[PDB]
Ligand binder design. Sequence first.
Ligand SMILES: N[C@@H](CCC(=O)N[C@@H](CS)C(=O)NCC(=O)O)C(=O)O
Ligand SMILES: N[C@@H](CCC(=O)N[C@@H](CS)C(=O)NCC(=O)O)C(=O)O
Lengths: 206, 205
Amino acid sequence: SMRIYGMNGSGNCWKAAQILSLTGHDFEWVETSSGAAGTRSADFLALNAIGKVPVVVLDDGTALRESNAILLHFAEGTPWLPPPGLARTRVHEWLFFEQYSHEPYIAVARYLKSWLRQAHLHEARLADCATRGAAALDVMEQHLAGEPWLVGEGPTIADLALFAYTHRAEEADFDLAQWPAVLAWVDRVAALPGINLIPPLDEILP
Amino acid sequence: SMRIYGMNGSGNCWKAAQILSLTGHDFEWVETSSGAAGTRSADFLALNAIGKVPVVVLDDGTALRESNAILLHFAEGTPWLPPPGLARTRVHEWLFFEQYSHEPYIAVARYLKSWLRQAHLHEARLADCATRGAAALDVMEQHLAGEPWLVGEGPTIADLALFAYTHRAEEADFDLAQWPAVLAWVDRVAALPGINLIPPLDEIL
Ligand SMILES: N[C@@H](CCC(=O)N[C@@H](CS)C(=O)NCC(=O)O)C(=O)O
Ligand SMILES: N[C@@H](CCC(=O)N[C@@H](CS)C(=O)NCC(=O)O)C(=O)O
């Protein structure tokens, strides 16, 4: 039976659970810690040498890693992933934008401020995050002011990939009211059948 | 005719030029500055709101961005990219690992040290790059010690994506002799027909 190794509250892990649920796959969740008892354990590194969650393990033992690769793997042949061509390429562009220009600022600031509550250890990092995260939101705003979805005329895994952390941007100290087209898109994605939100970290973390 | 907006010496821009030449596409290179005269100019931001090179613009006006998306776009239907399935997923995994775990350390160290020659101004960051870049090479080494290519039995865009900066790792002060499987793989990729190396940055300056 299929397993997701993940951390409760993680947007990257949410991507994996969300696409599995959207595409009709049953799975077992395995709560995995950070460090020698989890992501840096012998057993885990045997699944993923990179030492990161999410990892999805198929009933045949195959271990899949990288949240955006997991989105691509399970969305293949569904309306969540266009076929090769311009639309698929536009999806790819947003997924690499997400990993390079968005996640490292939004997800990280949320982690440091609302998960660890270590704002004080990362003043420099956090100011940079605030600036570069705002720039990533500006890119999303510019696009979503003119089209309601990231690609083509309907939702795709590009929307899922950027929704993962953007829907919880308040925990990274971003006020989405200042990016009204992004806010409207967050609401549009949240209203889609089958989409679930990450509850507030304060309510799910020990 | 097709254009590539890029920076000479850039590994990410090399990915675009390299896949276009491997797949038989002629292109015009357009050198693009960093900042108001290039990547942050109004004309360039109209092509790519992210304000980053490479950008590939087709004759019909279509502007493509993100070096790994550009690899995916032009490799589709060629031996460089398998059709959907497990091997194709393995390719994706390496492309995301490259962007998240490898490029931000190896490409950035190379740029700050060997392009800008400002190592003295980025101490904490470059120490972090040295540590995390080494970890990324360890992942590559563990794989490549057991097989010659990143995915399956032959070269794919996974190899191209990782080769782009790894082949010039010496400019970020990584000695590839210390990762012998990665060293062997760099030579293996470099020997494929039509693969061109990025010239040393000291020849470009
Ligand atoms: N590029 C990866 C990044 C995943 C990632 O950063 N995972 C984190 C949690 S959100 C992790 O496993 N932390 C590393 C550790 O604890 O060692 C992806 O999108 O899957
Ligand atoms: N994820 C991008 C990264 C590209 C990138 O970092 N390009 C830099 C090269 S210096 C850039 O254009 N930055 C210019 C700017 O931000 O103004 C890709 O792979 O294409």
